[PDB]
Amino acid sequence: GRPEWIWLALGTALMGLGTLYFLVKGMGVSDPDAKKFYAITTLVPAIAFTMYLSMLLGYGLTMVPFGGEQNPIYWARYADWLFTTPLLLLDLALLVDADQGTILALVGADGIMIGTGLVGALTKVYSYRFVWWAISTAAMLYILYVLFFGFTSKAESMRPEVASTFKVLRNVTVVLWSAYPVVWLIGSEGAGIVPLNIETLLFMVLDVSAKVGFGLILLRSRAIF
Amino acid sequence: GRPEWIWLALGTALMGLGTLYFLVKGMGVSDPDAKKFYAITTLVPAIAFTMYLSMLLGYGLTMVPFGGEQNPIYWARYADWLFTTPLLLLDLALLVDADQGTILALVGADGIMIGTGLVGALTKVYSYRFVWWAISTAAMLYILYVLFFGFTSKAESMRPEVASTFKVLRNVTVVLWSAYPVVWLIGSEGAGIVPLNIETLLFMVLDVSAKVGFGLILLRSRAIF
Amino acid sequence: GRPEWIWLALGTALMGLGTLYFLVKGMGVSDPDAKKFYAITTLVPAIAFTMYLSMLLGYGLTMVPFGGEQNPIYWARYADWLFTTPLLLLDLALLVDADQGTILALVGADGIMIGTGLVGALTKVYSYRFVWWAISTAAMLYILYVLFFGFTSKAESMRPEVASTFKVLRNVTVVLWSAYPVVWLIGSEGAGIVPLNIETLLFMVLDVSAKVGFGLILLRSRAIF
Numbered sequence: 036g037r038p039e040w041i042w043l044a045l046g047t048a049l050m051g052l053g054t055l056y057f058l059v060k061g062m063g064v065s066d067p068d069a070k071k072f073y074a075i076t077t078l079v080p081a082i083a084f085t086m087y088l089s090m091l092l093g094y095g096l097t098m099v100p101f102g103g104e105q106n107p108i109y110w111a112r113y114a115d116w117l118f119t120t121p122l123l124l125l126d127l128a129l130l131v132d133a134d135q136g137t138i139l140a141l142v143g144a145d146g147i148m149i150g151t152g153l154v155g156a157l158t159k160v161y162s163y164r165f166v167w168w169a170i171s172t173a174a175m176l177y178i179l180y181v182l183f184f185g186f187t188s189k190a191e192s193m194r195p196e197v198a199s200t201f202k203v204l205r206n207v208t209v210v211l212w213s214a215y216p217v218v219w220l221i222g223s224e225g226a227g228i229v230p231l232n233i234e235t236l237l238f239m240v241l242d243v244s245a246k247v248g249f250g251l252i253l254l255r256s257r258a259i260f
Numbered sequence: 261g262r263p264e265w266i267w268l269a270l271g272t273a274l275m276g277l278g279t280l281y282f283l284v285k286g287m288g289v290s291d292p293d294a295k296k297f298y299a300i301t302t303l304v305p306a307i308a309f310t311m312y313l314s315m316l317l318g319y320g321l322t323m324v325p326f327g328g329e330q331n332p333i334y335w336a337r338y339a340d341w342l343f344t345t346p347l348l349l350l351d352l353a354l355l356v357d358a359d360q361g362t363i364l365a366l367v368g369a370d371g372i373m374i375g376t377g378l379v380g381a382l383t384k385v386y387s388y389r390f391v392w393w394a395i396s397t398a399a400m401l402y403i404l405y406v407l408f409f410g411f412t413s414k415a416e417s418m419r420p421e422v423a424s425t426f427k428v429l430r431n432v433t434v435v436l437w438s439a440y441p442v443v444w445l446i447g448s449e450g451a452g453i454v455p456l457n458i459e460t461l462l463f464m465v466l467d468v469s470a471k472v473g474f475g476l477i478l479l480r481s482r483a484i485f
Numbered sequence: 486g487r488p489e490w491i492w493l494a495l496g497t498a499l500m501g502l503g504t505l506y507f508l509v510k511g512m513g514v515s516d517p518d519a520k521k522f523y524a525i526t527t528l529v530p531a532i533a534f535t536m537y538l539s540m541l542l543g544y545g546l547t548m549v550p551f552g553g554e555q556n557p558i559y560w561a562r563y564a565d566w567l568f569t570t571p572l573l574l575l576d577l578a579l580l581v582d583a584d585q586g587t588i589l590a591l592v593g594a595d596g597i598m599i600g601t602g603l604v605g606a607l608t609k610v611y612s613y614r615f616v617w618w619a620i621s622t623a624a625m626l627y628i629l630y631v632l633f634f635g636f637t638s639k640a641e642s643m644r645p646e647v648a649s650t651f652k653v654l655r656n657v658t659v660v661l662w663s664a665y666p667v668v669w670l671i672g673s674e675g676a677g678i679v680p681l682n683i684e685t686l687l688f689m690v691l692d693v694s695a696k697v698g699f700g701l702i703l704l705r706s707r708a709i710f
C-alpha cells in the first residue's frame with residue numbers, strides 16, 4: 036500500500052477533527068439523554084481515528100493470497116466497523132426508543148455482518164470469499180429492514196423533532212450502509228473491477244459520511260434532548 | 261481435515277435450518293418478553309451456522325504442533341462457543357429472572373471457560389494443554405452450580421409453566437455442557453483416545469442439541485411469555 | 486523470557502489467592518448491591534490469574550522486531566487489561582452511581598486506551614510505537630479526569646461511608662493507573678531504559694495492587710452495601 040496513503044491520511048485527519056468537534060461540542064451538555072447521544076456519537080469517530088491511523092502507519096494492512104496474487108487487505112476496516120456500526124445502531128435505537136429485544140437482534144446481526152465480512156476478506160479461496168459476502172449482505176438487509184420498517188413506526192409515536200431527525204438519519208444509513216457490499220464486491224477484496232486506490236477512496240468517503248456526517252446531522256439537532 | 265467434512269457440512273445444514281425455523285416462528289410474536297427470548301435464541305444458531313461453515317470451507321481449521329505432530333485444531337469451535345454460551349446463559353437467566361450480579365458472574369465465568377479452553381487447544385506444550393483444561397472445567401463446574409442450585413430456587417418463585425420449563429432446560433444444559441470437557445479430553449485436542457472424525461461427530465451432536473434442541477424446548481413453550 | 490519467570494509465577498500465585506479470598510469472602514453476602522460489587526471485583530483477579538499463567542507457561546509471550554532486535558513482548562498483559570480495567574471502572578461507577586452515558590464514555594475510552602496501547606507494543610516500526618503510546622495516554626488522562634472531577638462530585642451526594650471509600654479508591658486508581666504509561670515508556674516496549682526483568686517486576690506490583698489491593702480496600706468496606 037502506497038498510492039492510497041493520501042486517502043488514509045485524509046481519513047485520519049477528518050475522523051480526528053470529527054472527534055475534537057463533538058467532544059468540544061458536547062462539553063456544555065447537561066441533559067442525560069443528550070449526554071448519552073454525545074457519548075455514543077463521539078466514540079464512533081474516535082475509534083475510526085485509531086483504525087485509520089493504523090492503516091496509514093502500516094499496521095492495519097495485511098496480505099492475503101487469493102488468485103495468482105498476494106492481495107493487500109486493510110483489516111483495520113473490519114476492526115473499525117465492528118465497534119462502530121453497533122454504536123451507530125444504538126444512536127438510532129435510543130432516538131426511536133427501541134426494545135431491548137430488537138437491539139440485541141440488531142447488534143447480534145451486525146456483529147455477524149462484520150465478522151462474516153471479515154472472514155470473506157481473509158479467505159484464501161477466491162470463490163468462497165463470495166459466499167461470506169452473501170451471508171454478510173443478507174444480514175445487512177435484515178438490519179436495514181427493521182431499521183426502516185420497525186424503527187420508523189417506533190419514531191412516529193414521538194415528538195416530531197425526533198420523528199423527523201430519525202427520518203433523515205434512517206435514509207442516510209440505509210443508503211450509505213448498502214454502499215459497502217457494493218464497493219467491496221467491485222474492489223480488490225472481491226470481483227476486482229476497481230483498483231485499491233479507488234476502493235480506499237470510496238470507503239473513505241462512506242466512513243467519513245457515516246461516522247462524522249451522521250454525527251453532525253444528529254448532534255446538531257434538538258432531537259437528542 | 262477431510263473425513264469429518266460430512267459432520268461439519270451436516271452441522272452447517274442443521275444450524276442453518278435451525279435459524280430459519282426460529283426466525284419464521286418468532287415472526288408473529290408481539291410479547292416483548294417472548295420477543296427477547298426469540299431474539300436471544302435465534303442468534304445462537306445463526307452464529308453457530310457461520311462458525312460451522314468456516315470449518316467446512318476450511319477457514320476455522322488450524323494446525324497446532326504438540327507431541328511429535330502438527331495437530332488439526334478447529335478453533336471456530338471456540339469462536340462459536342464464546343458468543344453462543346453467554347446467550348444461552350441469558351435465556352436461562354431471563355427465564356428465571358436473575359440478578360444483574362449473578363449474570364455478570366456467569367458471563368464472566370463463561371468467557372473464562374471458553375478463552376481458557378481455547379488457550380488449551382492452541383498450547384504447543386502437550387502437558388500444559390491439560391492445566392487449561394482443568395481451569396476451563398473448574399469454571400464450568402462453577403457455572404453449572406449456580407445454574408442448578410441458584411437458578412432453580414429462583415424459578416420456584418414463578419409461574420409453574422416457567423418453573424417447569426426451566427427444570428427441563430436446566431437438566432439439558434447441565435448434562436450437555438459437561439460432555440464437552442469429556443469429549444475434548446479424549447479427542448485429538450487432549451489425551452488422544454478418539455480420532456478427529458469422531459471428536460467432530462460428537463461435538464456436532466452436542467452443538468446441535470445445545471443450540472437447536474434447547475431452542476426448540478424453550479421457544480415451543482409458553483414459559484417465554 | 487526466563488529471568489522474570491519468578492515475577493510471573495509470583496503474580497500467578499497472588500492473583501490466584503486473590504480470587505480465592507474474594508470468592509470465599511462474598512459467599513455469605515445477601516445484599517444485591519454488595520453481591521454485584523463482589524461479582525465485578527472477584528472477576529478482575531480471576532482473569533488476571535489466567536493471563537499471568539499464560540505468561541508463565543509461555544503462551545502470553547510474543548516476539549516483535551523493532552530496532553536491530555526481536556523483542557519479547559508479553560501481550561497477555563494487554564488481553565488482561567482489556568477486560569480488567571473496564572470492570573474496575575464499573576466498580577467505581579456503581580459506587581458513585583454514574584450515568585449510563587458517562588460509563589459508556591469511560592468504557593469506550595478505556596477500550597481505546599488498551600487496544601491502542603496494544604497496537605503500540607506490536608508495532609514493528611520503533612518510532613511509531615510512540616505515537617500509539619501518546620494516543621493511549623491521552624485517553625487515560627481523559628479517564629482519570631472524569632474519574633477524579635466527575636465521579637468525586639457524584640460521590641459527594643452519597644452516604645459518607647461511600648463518599649470516603651470512593652475517595653480512597655479514586656486516589657488509588659489515579660496514582661496506580663498513571664504508572665503504566667511511565668513503566669511502559671522506560672521498559673523494553675518503549676525507550677529501553679529498564680530491562681525486561683524489572684519492567685515485568687514493576688507491572689507485577691501495579692497489577693497486584695490495582696487488582697487485588699483495590700479489591701481489598703473496596704470489599705472490606707461497608708460502602709459496597
Ligand SMILES: *C\C=C(C)/C=C/C=C(C)/C=C/C1=C(C)CCCC1(C)C
Nearest residue numbers: 119152171172175212215216219245
Ligand atoms: C462505519 C460505518 C458504517 C455504517 C459501516 C458499515 C459497514 C458495512 C455495512 C459493511 C457491509 C459489508 C457487507 C454488507 C458485505 C461485505 C463486507 C462488508 C463488511 C463490506
Ligand SMILES: *C\C=C(C)/C=C/C=C(C)/C=C/C1=C(C)CCCC1(C)C
Nearest residue numbers: 344377396397400437440441444470
Ligand atoms: C454451543 C453450546 C454449548 C453449551 C457449548 C459449551 C461448551 C463448553 C461448555 C466447553 C467446555 C470446555 C471445557 C469445560 C474444558 C475444555 C475446553 C471446552 C471449551 C471444550
Ligand SMILES: *C\C=C(C)/C=C/C=C(C)/C=C/C1=C(C)CCCC1(C)C
Nearest residue numbers: 569602621622625662665666669695
Ligand atoms: C490491571 C489494572 C489496571 C488499572 C491496568 C491499567 C493499565 C493501563 C492504565 C495501561 C496504560 C497504558 C498507557 C496509558 C499507554 C501505554 C500502554 C499502556 C497499556 C501500558
